Amino acid sequence: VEYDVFLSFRGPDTRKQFTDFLYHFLCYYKIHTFRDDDELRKGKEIGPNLLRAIDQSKIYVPIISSGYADSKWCLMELAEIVRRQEEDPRRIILPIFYMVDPSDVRHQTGCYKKAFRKHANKFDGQTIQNWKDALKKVGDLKGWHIGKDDEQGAIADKVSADIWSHISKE
């Protein structure tokens, strides 16, 4: 009746390019999945929607993309995932890199330099250091890299069971 898996991704990039079949395929294993498309903006952080499901989730599974560092909502939301995780280690994180190196995520260089080149003219000089401290630790856990040739279909089946193995056996 509650949520056992909570996703997070980019808007226009992978909303109907891959994360869609992965969300659907998952519903065939009899588990309730949460994905959201509402652009929020109704304020700066909504409570009964995101904040509710965050504490209700069980396996936070982000999906870092190529342009995941531009949307002003995603990063500061990810800062709430990995922060809540460090307080109670009962839950886990299974990131999935996508079309990007597992090196442009630990130092925000490469395809993110342009992103933080303009993000530093608006916000505080400490809030940005809060993101780069949280975004870094995500790029150290285990994760299926998806190269240019790997099957966008076989990976889904392999990763889904790893989410279903931690539920049946508990």
Place this chain on the structure above:
DNA sequence: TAATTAATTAATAATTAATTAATAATTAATTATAATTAATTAA
């Protein structure tokens, strides 16, 4: 030279939503106006 980082300066789309901007028309229904022809009646 290429390459990128670093500081600064610089220039049309697209919807979101507020509002105003088109009588037009047809349907439903309302009142008003002219004569002609026919018969009868009075020079």
